[PDB]
């Protein structure tokens, strides 16, 4: 890894700084409200 | 919540034709939804009438309702017309229209959805 | 098509007591395209079981579907009385399909 960051192939002694460590998502969810009513909108547009 | 509202029930005359429908409150006929149309007569054992695709657009009669009636339906709205020419004595009785609740292509094999029928008479 | 009897015409038993019920047919033999049905006058039919093997939405437990051959069977475990009405077998494998006559249970 700290070849890979450094763009060398021997690394000197020290101490180097790499990528992050982080936390991946599991899973998804979604809540939108609950209705389901279907909106009047044949009545605006086919009006005569 | 999904529940089937039907027309309400009707007088006609001998030597003319019927259009029938119903609805849905929040229920839509969609791709994969189909239903079938059921009458009941007094104190008599029901009847199939027929079924309809609303995507493919394939519909299945009875052998002896091959002359009479017509099944269409129009995704969009969603709805369902029933054309059924000379009603005699014999056709006076409560049709149904039954679909189950299926969305996703993922609904069983019973029709759960029930409409209350229009009890049709032609004197 | 297949011409179904249902199986006893009449019941009366006391209520609580276990039920079974049978439909029979001729035609082309499917099991798990059957359903049961029970209809109260003046309101539409609600259905029971679907396919010979699962329950719809809010059946309770008392139904219970059974048989392996061309028979088709249910069963009843306790006869609350607001159960007193007609059943009926529907199958969809075959051609244009047909009812049966009905079993009315009473009191
Ligand atoms: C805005 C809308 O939905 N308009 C529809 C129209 O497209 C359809 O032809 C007609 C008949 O069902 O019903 C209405």
């Known amino acids: 890894e700290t070849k890979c960051t450094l763009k060398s192939f021997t690394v000197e002694k020290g101490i180097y700084q790499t990528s992050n460590f982080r936390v991946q998502p599991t899973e998804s969810i979604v809540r939108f409200p609950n209705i389901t009513n279907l909106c009047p909108f044949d009545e605006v547009f086919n009006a005569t | 919540q999904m529940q089937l509202v039907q027309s309400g029930p009707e007088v006609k005359k001998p030597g003319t034709s019927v259009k029938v429908s119903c609805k849905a409150s929040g229920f839509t006929f969609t791709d994969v939804s189909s239903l079938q149309w059921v009458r009941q007569a007094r104190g008599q054992r029901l009847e199939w009438i027929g079924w309809?695709?609303?995507?493919?657009?394939?519909?299945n009669y009875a052998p002896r309702f091959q002359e009479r009636v017509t099944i269409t339906t129009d995704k969009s709205t969603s709805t369902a017309y029933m054309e059924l020419s000379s009603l005699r004595s014999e056709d006076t009785a409560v049709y149904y229209c039954?679909?189950?609740?299926?969305?996703?292509?993922?609904?069983?094999?019973?029709?759960?959805?029930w409409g209350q029928g229009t009890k049709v008479t032609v004197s | 098509e297949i011409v179904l009897t249902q199986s006893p015409g009449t019941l009366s038993l006391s209520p609580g007591d276990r039920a079974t019920l049978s439909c029979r047919a001729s035609?082309?033999?499917?099991?798990?395209?059957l359903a049961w049905y029970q209809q109260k006058p003046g309101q539409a039919p609600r259905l029971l079981i679907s396919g010979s093997s699962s329950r719809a939405t809010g059946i309770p437990d008392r139904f219970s579907a059974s048989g392996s051959g061309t028979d088709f069977t249910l069963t009843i475990s306790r006869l609350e009385p607001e159960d007193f009405a007609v059943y009926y077998c529907?199958?969809?494998?075959?051609?244009?399909?047909?009812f049966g006559q009905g079993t009315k249970v009473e009191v």
């Open positions: 309809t695709v609303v995507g493919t657009g394939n519909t």
């Open positions: 035609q082309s033999v499917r099991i798990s395209y």
């Open positions: 529907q199958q969809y494998a075959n051609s244009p399909w047909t």
């Open positions: 039954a679909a189950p609740f299926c969305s996703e292509t993922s609904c069983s094999d019973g029709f759960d959805l």
